[PDB]
Amino acid sequence: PFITVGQENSTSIDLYYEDHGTGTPVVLIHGFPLSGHSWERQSAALLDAGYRVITYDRRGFGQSSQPTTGYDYDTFAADLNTVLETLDLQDAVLVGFSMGTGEVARYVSSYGTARIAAVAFLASLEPFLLKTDDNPDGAAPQEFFDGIVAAVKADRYAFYTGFFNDFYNLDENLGTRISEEAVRNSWNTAASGGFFAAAAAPTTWYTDFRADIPRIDVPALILHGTGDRTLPIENTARVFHKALPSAEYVEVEGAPHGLLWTHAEEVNTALLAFLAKAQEAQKQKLLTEVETYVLSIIPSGPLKAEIAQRLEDVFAGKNTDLEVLMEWLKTRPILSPLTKGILGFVFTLTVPSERGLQRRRFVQNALNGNGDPNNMDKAVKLYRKLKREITFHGAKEISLSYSAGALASCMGLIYNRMGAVTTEVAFGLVCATCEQIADS
Amino acid sequence: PFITVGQENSTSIDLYYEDHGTGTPVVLIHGFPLSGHSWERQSAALLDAGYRVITYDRRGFGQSSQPTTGYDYDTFAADLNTVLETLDLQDAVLVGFSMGTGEVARYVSSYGTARIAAVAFLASLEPFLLKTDDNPDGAAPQEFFDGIVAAVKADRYAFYTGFFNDFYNLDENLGTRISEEAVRNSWNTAASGGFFAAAAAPTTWYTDFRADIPRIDVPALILHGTGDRTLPIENTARVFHKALPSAEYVEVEGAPHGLLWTHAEEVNTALLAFLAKAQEAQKQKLLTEVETYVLSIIPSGPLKAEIAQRLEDVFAGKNTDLEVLMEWLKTRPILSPLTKGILGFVFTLTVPSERGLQRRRFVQNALNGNGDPNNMDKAVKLYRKLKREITFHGAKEISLSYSAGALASCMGLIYNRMGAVTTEVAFGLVCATCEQIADS
Amino acid sequence: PFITVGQENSTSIDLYYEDHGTGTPVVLIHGFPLSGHSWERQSAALLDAGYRVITYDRRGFGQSSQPTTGYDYDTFAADLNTVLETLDLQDAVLVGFSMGTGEVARYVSSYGTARIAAVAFLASLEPFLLKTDDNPDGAAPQEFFDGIVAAVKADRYAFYTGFFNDFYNLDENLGTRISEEAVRNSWNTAASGGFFAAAAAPTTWYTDFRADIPRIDVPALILHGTGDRTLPIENTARVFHKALPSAEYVEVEGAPHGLLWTHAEEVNTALLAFLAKAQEAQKQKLLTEVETYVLSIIPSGPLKAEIAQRLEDVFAGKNTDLEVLMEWLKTRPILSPLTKGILGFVFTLTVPSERGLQRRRFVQNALNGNGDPNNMDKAVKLYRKLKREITFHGAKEISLSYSAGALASCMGLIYNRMGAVTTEVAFGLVCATCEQIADS
Amino acid sequence: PFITVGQENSTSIDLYYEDHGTGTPVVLIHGFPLSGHSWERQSAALLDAGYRVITYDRRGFGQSSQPTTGYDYDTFAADLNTVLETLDLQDAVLVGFSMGTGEVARYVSSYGTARIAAVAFLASLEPFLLKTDDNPDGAAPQEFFDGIVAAVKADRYAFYTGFFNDFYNLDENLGTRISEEAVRNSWNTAASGGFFAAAAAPTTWYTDFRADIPRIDVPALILHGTGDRTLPIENTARVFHKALPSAEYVEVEGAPHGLLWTHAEEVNTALLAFLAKAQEAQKQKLLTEVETYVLSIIPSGPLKAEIAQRLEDVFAGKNTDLEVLMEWLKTRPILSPLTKGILGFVFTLTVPSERGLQRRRFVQNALNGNGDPNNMDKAVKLYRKLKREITFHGAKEISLSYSAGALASCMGLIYNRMGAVTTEVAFGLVCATCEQIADS
């Protein structure tokens, strides 16, 4: 897949991207001289964990175009911006590794956090690697960077191997943390990046990111390997945390620069922990909106009290015996059969485990649109549109344009697995139904 | 409800009819001076037994028009003909009581048995009640009938009560077999028939039905009350059986003329027994056609042998554990998931008892039309048409005009109870599907 | 008269109904095993009282069709729905007696109260007939109900007799409140209902309506006979009133189940009271609504206060000299010409007596849409639609879709009697106009 | 080149494919973890042999997109379907290697063989990979398969190395059959497939295809290496051939899994043999079909026998002097002018060499549709449709919808080279004509 970010000469600039999974969007920004593919260990864990995963290759790397222009953090941040806006990502998590942490700071700083839920910095450049009279801490003098440039220009090919020696602590980590062949692929990935980008990248490393830091307004994670040869933990990791006290700080004991590949297990653990805090927070707000809509159709009373606890407890994660819950609903005197079907649907959808329970006749009968062909016809039409929706509100908005009979029939269609939509879109459907019924 | 059979003066002649239930059509032809309503005991048992029940009131009686014309068995038979043809009854059972047995003989005799599966004669007129030199047996001389006519013309109202005394053996049966109030209603029903019809009916009683008898080509039942004052068993019941040896003969020990109301339990028993022989015979032919279609999609082999026994055993009525059957199908190596869904559907439909088993996920998934909205759209369209069908072939014919995806989706729709059709129509749907698949 | 509600085999299902009188529509829903004719004592008082009276026979009873299907409250509710929609009843009063009270709760609960002004429950089933471990209230265990079914099978005819005495407390009430002849007619009516219907009705009695009750937003009346054997007052009457405290309650001291025929005087009094009170209750609220809209276009001041004081007085019924009122408006410095036209219109419409006065020149000139043909064209179009609406809000909603010029012209059209609409539809028209003008 | 098969989040899924050569279409479906490029030894022989060659990369491999969805044989079958339908392949040969043999069985089983002439299975998965109590045949228990998955997670890179040796029997085959460089390329190809794809592929290996096998109606080839570690020949190879006895079987003595690159000579021989044999097999059957249609219009006689003897001889390949044949036809007393035109056309079409002869005047005159513009108009319309059909029956079916005049004119159009269609489509045209004429 490609996203066009600009034009050079007669040929556009295209950034290779792959997007995976469903759920809260997590964008991974790779390090030098690798590509989106370097995050495979991170990607597999995020997919299992239930998160949308977006990866892209920075201009000059992996499968993106190889212009001879735009090697700067402003351009790189603008490249990121185009990706975000192209995909209309909201409530996204931005995770940068090495060079990628420069993108995360600069984007947040310049563009703001409206689409952004949280950020994570792994093996960070921050704050400022250039060692200057104004700031003593920065790791190396300018002469040192000038050094690398010269080395890459002399030989990209030997140079990648040299970076690998530094990058992975191969004397320490070979044959242990990772196989050599896996390492060999990384050289192949680097050899595959543009010749111009290879020599121009090292000049972006000593960008001063100190100004950007005060901007971050969203929860952050800082993660560094204490055995980091490439980016000394003290110069950046020690310093950055002091600049952003609030963000949780994790140190990976004796991890080299290449923690994710060498130390993917430690990285995933640390990252998923930090992400879980931001994920569960908006997960609850998803549950809460659903609950008000669901409660709106129930008559006020003690039963409405019992139901609310069930909505809240399963929502909070207490795995309940759906079989027990369903029998209770089924036998409740107060509820209308329609109401019981809606609740029946909600519970099976939200309960942690269905425990292989067969669908319930009381629900199938309640959500069948009176077996009316016109209701069913419209329900099938709605379903088609819902398959294209990805948010709760978009789903709820389109659903409200349908009659209650058609909405109930659509719910039965999903309930019975004759069709499938994402969870949040299903919530929007049942909420539009509740809204229509309550309004009656 | 009315069916127009003719014209008198400026006003048409309309026969009041009510049709009930679903299944093999059973037409009940009442006796004098009552209406279709007199068969309530017969009707309730036939409805529970699962038979379509058609009743109508003979011209001049109950709620039909009261012309001053057409009191003959040719007209009455032609009236019956119009009803049969109006409703397009096929494989019908004709049951006549008293006067109604004249309709059954004359219709069969003149029109043939193409729409007719079996006949039943209760408290029959047959063969010939007129006592003549040519036939000694006939119960009374002409002078006797002439008698009744004269009596009805003098007083319809007293006369009905007199008929009731004879009709029910009230000295024997009052306060025992039936309450007086129920008897009182019968007088009300009679008082409600036309004045002209009341006096003209008795003249049709000594119609010679001997010629008609040789025509009957369908299984018959003859049932008579040995305490029949109104139609002496020997003159008609004894004689008729000799004329039609083949038909089963049942004698209701000490039952009066009004066996059905007085003796509804004995009547129902006897009638349902005779009907069961004719019902089960075409019931099997319904199962057999379904089986060939179902078998046509299974690969030839030992499995196809195991499946056939299941089709045949459940079809023959051996209540099988559907849960056991379904698990077996589910775990069968040979069957395609589609094939297993079709069989899954067939078995749940034909098994005597489902034993409150939840619908199966393997079947729901197999019959979901790939969750495709166009398949579902067409399936809903087919369903609408199928709701209007009442036969296996009509259903199968319309179904074959739909694609396999739409047919499978329609089956899932019925399977999941999102819609409902009659059993034979559902068989036509699954058979059209098998036919389409086999042809592929 | 008949209204078709469905199809049974080859026949339709038709409900016999009667339309009488003019005025606010009152629909009477009879009890078992009687028909719309059983309300004759109530119907006569209502006609005298000036209320349109709609009666119908439930399927299986009196002169309606006698299918062998549809005997459930959902079916009963839907049958009622068809009647309401067929006749386009708005601001209707629904009165149910015994079984009929199940229809009232069901119709209100499922379909809402848009066509409904008030409900009345006489000798009510609710909330629950059944006696279960969950509920103290229920009158009897299931087995007795099953037995009543059983009694019908043995004797519909004979059964009616025992049922009538309990229904009327004949030992207490014969020869005083109720004549033998009156009772005889009731038996005849019952004997005339469908045989299938009589045995299927008793199964609908223990339907659970408790969930249903919370639904109603329209003033209700609960009326029960303290001597009612058929539906024990305390078991149902005490229970229902507790479930719906707001609705007015009347206990008829020592009245049996069959109270209205025996106790027609008490019934009429209670019913006519409830109707007159609920009517004036909605008239006053309706009047208040009109005043805010009318006042919204007037400038704050003494004149506005006068309109406020004057409106309120005529609204409260103080017959004012319209001639004096009109001259005052006409000569008001504060009043806009359009306001005088609007106020002029309002006053002539609401004043008790116009005293044969004349349409004001200013109103004629103020409400002429500037004599513009397009305004007049749209006003005629609006008028057509308004003739179809009996509700203040329906009228106001459709009116707001028209321009002010067209609305003013429409008002002139009504003012000048070139067209006619109900009063509350005329109020909606003048209110839409005020709303449009105020918004400008 | 790419073919889009679906959508994943914001991106489409594109399958990289290659189209080469001309002639009968042969589609090659690669094995894990390689790409369409792995068939290079086979592709070259086929091009020399004169067969169009279609290769594509399964999603997640070589140059196709790398979604995180769709890795199941139903998905694989549907991906293949899109390719076939996109290119409008007819009379195609499907050749699968390892994983690719799952596609061949799945496509044939679900979609049928309408576009398919023959199938070939090399180093096949089928019937069942899994070892279960039900089946002796399965190679391994589930846990080992789960473990292989586990290996991929630990090292995709390092994993490929061990896998390659088993795949190629490198201890046996290195430096002889297979070069180190060739092996290195294979590792590079695998390292290039999607990270998600590598771990998800092994789960599709134990798919059960036994039910699937019964489906095929098209000649098959089964080819296995007796030294194949990856897919034990006896466990799968012995089992599959027993399941499909009719299909030709070849065992490659001591060939590993990776046989074609090592054993390209044996592979080419076997494949080119199967292709040439299956082609002549369908040519002969096709030839026989043409003869019955052609003979159907001739009068019984010596001339008919000559057409029968002559047709058969040219059909069998005896190159006859068309000039001599044409003069004979031309001068035949028995032959109709139309028959000479039809036979004339058939002979020039089927004779091995036309020897630069000329279109017959009689054929030109016999096949001119009487020079009628409407015939010619329809013939041009038919021609357009025929250009789209590569199948004798598809051509014959569409042709039969045209009148004889139009059909004869169309034949003249082709005869005269004013238009061109395939040979088997031309046969369908002349056969539809014969059918129409014979029916007259």
Residue A193, φ and ψ in degrees, nearest 5: -70, 160
Interface touch C11/B17, C-beta < 8 Å: yes
Dist. CA B132–CA B155, nearest whole Å: 29
Residue D33: cis peptide before it, omega within 30 degrees of 0: yes
Residue D372's Cβ-count burial label (10 Å; 0-12, 13-18, 19+) is middle
Dist. CA D38–CA D33, nearest whole Å: 10
Residue D204 carries which side chain, given as an amino acid letter?
Answer: T
CA-based torsion, C403, C405, C406, C410: positive or negative: positive
User: E-strand spans in A159-317?
Assistant: 220-225, 248-252
Q: Do domains B1-279 and B280-366 have the same CATH topology?
A: no
Q: Do chains B and D touch (3 or more CB pairs under 8 A)?
A: yes
Distances (CA, A) of B57 to B79, B111, B213, C26, C197: 10, 21, 24, 36, 19
* Distance to chain C for B137, nearest Cα, Å: 38
* Distance to chain A for D164, nearest Cα, Å: 13
Pick from B303, B327, B334 the residue to mutate for testing the D interface (most D CBs within 10 Å): B334
Q: Which helix (H) or strand (E) holds A12?
A: strand A11-20
Question: What's the start-to-end Cα distance of chain B, in Å?
Answer: 47
| Strand-pair partners of A7 | A12
* Distance to chain D for B300, nearest Cα, Å: 9
Interchain contact C12–B (C-beta under 8 A): yes
PDB experimental method: X-ray
Dist. CA A20–CA D59, nearest whole Å: 14
Interface touch B334/D210, C-beta < 8 Å: yes
| Tokens 């590509």, located at residue | A35
| CA triple D286-D291-D295, angle to 5 deg | 160
Contacts of D80 (CB under 8 A, 6+ apart): D27, D29, D94, D103, D106, D107
Q: Do chains B and C touch (3 or more CB pairs under 8 A)?
A: yes
Interchain contact B352–D (C-beta under 8 A): no
Residue B238's Cβ-count burial label (10 Å; 0-12, 13-18, 19+) is middle
Task: Give the β-pairing of D52-56 and D25-29.
Answer: parallel
* Torsion angle of C-alpha atoms D20, D22, D25, D27, degrees rounded to 10: -10
CATH code, D1-279? 3.40.50.1820
* Distance to chain A for B101, nearest Cα, Å: 43
Dist. CA C156–CA A297, nearest whole Å: 43
Three-state SS sequence of A352-397: CCCCCCCCCHHHHHHCCHHHCHHHHHHHHHHHHHHHCCCCHHHHHH
How many CA atoms, within 13 angstroms, populate the side-chain half-sphere of residue B266? 20
Q: Which helix (H) or strand (E) holds A19?
A: strand A11-20
User: Could you tell me which chain D residue has the CA closest to the CA of B335?
Assistant: D211
Residue spans of the domains in chain C: they are 1-279, 280-366, 367-440
Dist. CA C376–CA C416, nearest whole Å: 13
Report the b/e string of A70-104 with b at 16+ CB within 10 A: bbebebbbbbbbebbeebebeebbbbbbbbbbbbb
Interchain contact A303–C (C-beta under 8 A): no
Order of strands across the sheet that contains B248-252: B2-8, B11-20, B52-56, B25-29, B92-97, B116-122, B220-225, B248-252
| Tokens 């090659």, located at residue | D28
CATH code, B280-366? 1.20.91.10
Contacts of A298 (CB under 8 A, 6+ apart): A304, A307, A334, A335, A339
Task: Give the β-pairing of B11-20 and B2-8.
Answer: antiparallel
Interchain contact B40–C (C-beta under 8 A): yes
Task: Give the β-pairing of A52-56 and A92-97.
Answer: unpaired
How many Å separate Cα B304 from the centre of its chain?
Answer: 36
User: Could you tell me which chain A residue has the CA closest to the CA of B368?
Assistant: A418
Interface touch B371/A409, C-beta < 8 Å: no
| Strand-pair partners of A12 | A7
Active-site option among A224, A241, A257, A263? A257
Residue D331's Cβ-count burial label (10 Å; 0-12, 13-18, 19+) is exposed
| Catalytically active residues of B, by annotation | 98, 228, 257
CB C329 within 8 A of CB C343: yes
| Tokens 């007209």, located at residue | B75
Dist. CA A394–CA A378, nearest whole Å: 18
Contacts of B132 (CB under 8 A, 6+ apart): B138
Distances (CA, A) of D298 to D315, D339, D342, D399, D402: 18, 7, 11, 21, 22
CB C421 within 8 A of CB C429: yes
In angstroms, this model's resolution equals 7.4
Residue A75 carries which side chain, given as an amino acid letter?
Answer: T
Tokens of D400: 């039969």
Interchain contact B370–A (C-beta under 8 A): no
CB A55 within 8 A of CB A18: yes
Dist. CA D359–CA D347, nearest whole Å: 11
Measured from the Cβ of residue A187, the count of other Cβ atoms closer than 10 Å reads: 15
Considering only the beta carbons, identify the residue of C8, C11, C157 that sits closest to B185. C157
Q: In 3-state terms, what secondary structure has residue C166?
A: helix
Using N-to-C axis directions, what is the helix angle for A322-330 and A337-350, rounded to 10°? 170
Among residues C92, C100, C122, C97, the alpha carbon closest in space to that of C222 is found at C122
CB A415 within 8 A of CB A345: yes
Tokens of A266: 């430690």
Pick from C11, C63, C64, C66 the residue to mutate for testing the B interface (most B CBs within 10 Å): C11
Residue B113's Cβ-count burial label (10 Å; 0-12, 13-18, 19+) is middle
Residue B92, φ and ψ in degrees, nearest 5: -85, 150
Order of strands across the sheet that contains A220-225: A2-8, A11-20, A52-56, A25-29, A92-97, A116-122, A220-225, A248-252
Dist. CA A319–CA A313, nearest whole Å: 8
Dist. CA A225–CA A254, nearest whole Å: 6
Which residues in chain A are contacts of C211 at CB distance < 8 A? 299, 333-336, 339
Dist. CA B327–CA B321, nearest whole Å: 10
User: Could you tell me which chain C residue has the CA closest to the CA of B40?
Assistant: C195
Residue D301 carries which side chain, given as an amino acid letter?
Answer: G
Using N-to-C axis directions, what is the helix angle for B337-350 and B264-295, rounded to 10°? 170
Three-state SS sequence of chain D: CEEEEEEECCEEEEEEEEEECCCCEEEEECCCCCCHHHHHHHHHHHHHHCCEEEEECCCCCCCCCCCCCCCCHHHHHHHHHHHHHHHCCCCEEEEEECCHHHHHHHHHHHHCCCCEEEEEEECCCCCECECCCCCCCCCECHHHHHHHHHHHHHCHHHHHHHHHHHHHCHHHHECCCECHHHHHHHHHHHHCCCHHHHHHHHHHCCCECCCCHHHCCCCEEEEEECCCCCCCHHHHHHHHHHHCCCCEEEEECCCCCCHHHHCHHHHHHHHHHHHHHHHHHHHHHHHHHHHHHHHCCCCCCHHHHHHHHHHHHHHCCCCCCHHHHHHHHHCCCCCCHHHHHHHHHHHHHHCCCCCCCCCCHHHHHHCCHHHCHHHHHHHHHHHHHHCCCCCHHHHHHHHCCCCHHHHHHHHHHHHCCCCCCCHHHHHHHHHHHHHHHHHC
| Catalytically active residues of C, by annotation | 98, 228, 257
Considering only the beta carbons, identify the residue of D109, D112, D211 that sits closest to B333. D211
Among residues D283, D402, D291, D414, the alpha carbon closest in space to that of D341 is found at D414
Q: Do chains B and A touch (3 or more CB pairs under 8 A)?
A: yes
Dist. CA A32–CA A37, nearest whole Å: 12
How many CA atoms, within 13 angstroms, populate the side-chain half-sphere of residue C100? 27
CB D60 within 8 A of CB D197: yes
Residue B318's Cβ-count burial label (10 Å; 0-12, 13-18, 19+) is exposed
How many CA atoms, within 13 angstroms, populate the side-chain half-sphere of residue D47? 12
Distances (CA, A) of C202 to A247, C77, C198: 72, 17, 8
Interface touch D135/B333, C-beta < 8 Å: yes
* Distance to chain B for A204, nearest Cα, Å: 51
CB D319 within 8 A of CB D347: no
| CA triple D190-D195-D198, angle to 5 deg | 60
Interface touch D8/A17, C-beta < 8 Å: no
Dist. CA A274–CA A220, nearest whole Å: 8
| Strand-pair partners of B398 | none
Interchain contact B302–D (C-beta under 8 A): no
Residue length, chain A? 440
Measured from the Cβ of residue C212, the count of other Cβ atoms closer than 10 Å reads: 23
CB A92 within 8 A of CB A117: yes
Residue D127: cis peptide before it, omega within 30 degrees of 0: yes
Contacts of A294 (CB under 8 A, 6+ apart): A311, A342, A343, A346, A430, A431, A434
* Distance to chain B for C190, nearest Cα, Å: 11
Q: In 3-state terms, what secondary structure has residue A221?
A: strand
Interface touch A44/D187, C-beta < 8 Å: no
Residue A359, φ and ψ in degrees, nearest 5: -65, 150
Which residues in chain C are contacts of B186 at CB distance < 8 A? none
Q: What is the DSSP letter of A258?
A: -
Residue A33: cis peptide before it, omega within 30 degrees of 0: yes
Residue A182's Cβ-count burial label (10 Å; 0-12, 13-18, 19+) is buried
Which residues in chain A are contacts of B419 at CB distance < 8 A? 368, 371, 373, 376
Active-site option among A124, A228, A263, A399? A228
Residue length, chain D? 440
CB D68 within 8 A of CB D8: yes
Interface touch B87/C155, C-beta < 8 Å: no
Tokens of C393: 């809000």
Residue D263 carries which side chain, given as an amino acid letter?
Answer: H
* Distance to chain D for B333, nearest Cα, Å: 7
Measured from the Cβ of residue D328, the count of other Cβ atoms closer than 10 Å reads: 15
Which residues in chain D are contacts of A40 at CB distance < 8 A? 156, 195-196
Q: Do chains C and D touch (3 or more CB pairs under 8 A)?
A: no
Among residues B374, B351, B123, the alpha carbon closest in space to that of B255 is found at B123
Among residues C355, C348, C350, C353, the alpha carbon closest in space to that of C416 is found at C348
Dist. CA B144–CA C345, nearest whole Å: 85
Three-state SS sequence of chain B: CEEEEEEECCEEEEEEEEEECCCCEEEEECCCCCCHHHHHHHHHHHHHHCCEEEEECCCCCCCCCCCCCCCCHHHHHHHHHHHHHHHCCCCEEEEEECCHHHHHHHHHHHHCCCCEEEEEEECCCCCCCECCCCCCCCCECHHHHHHHHHHHHHCHHHHHHHHHHHHHCHHHHECCCECHHHHHHHHHHHHCCCHHHHHHHHHHCCCCCCCCHHHCCCCEEEEEECCCCCCCHHHHHHHHHHHCCCCEEEEECCCCCCHHHHCHHHHHHHHHHHHHHHHHHHHHHHHHHHHHHHHCCCCCCHHHHHHHHHHHHHHCCCCCCHHHHHHHHHCCCCCCHHHHHHHHHHHHHHCCCCCCCCCCHHHHHHCCHHHCHHHHHHHHHHHHHHHCCCCHHHHHHHHCCCCHHHHHHHHHHHHCCCCCCCHHHHHHHHHHHHHHHHHC
Residue B423 carries which side chain, given as an amino acid letter?
Answer: T
Pick from A334, A365, A436 the residue to mutate for testing the C interface (most C CBs within 10 Å): A334
Task: Count contacts between B and D (CB, < 8 Å).
Answer: 15
Residue A43's Cβ-count burial label (10 Å; 0-12, 13-18, 19+) is buried
Residue B264, φ and ψ in degrees, nearest 5: -60, -35
CB D246 within 8 A of CB D140: no
Which residues in chain C are contacts of A334 at CB distance < 8 A? 210-211
Dist. CA C249–CA B148, nearest whole Å: 62
| CATH for C367-440 (3.40.50.150, 3.40.50.620, 2.40.430.10, 1.10.10.180) | 1.10.10.180
Using N-to-C axis directions, what is the helix angle for B392-399 and B373-387, rounded to 10°? 150
Using N-to-C axis directions, what is the helix angle for B40-49 and B264-295, rounded to 10°? 30
| Tokens 């004997």, located at residue | C191
Which residues in chain D are contacts of B335 at CB distance < 8 A? 211
Dist. CA B220–CA B249, nearest whole Å: 9
Interchain contact B299–D (C-beta under 8 A): yes
Contacts of C262 (CB under 8 A, 6+ apart): C168, C173, C177, C178, C255, C256
Q: What is the DSSP letter of A233?
A: I
Which residues in chain D are contacts of A181 at CB distance < 8 A? 155, 157-158, 160-161, 187
Task: Give the β-pairing of C25-29 and C11-20.
Answer: unpaired
Interface touch B417/A360, C-beta < 8 Å: no
Residue B7's Cβ-count burial label (10 Å; 0-12, 13-18, 19+) is exposed
Active-site option among A98, A109, A124, A399? A98
CB C189 within 8 A of CB C183: no
Active-site option among D30, D224, D241, D257? D257
Dist. CA C264–CA D40, nearest whole Å: 101
Contacts of B14 (CB under 8 A, 6+ apart): B2, B3, B4, B5, B64, B65
CB C56 within 8 A of CB C20: no
Q: What is the DSSP letter of A238?
A: I
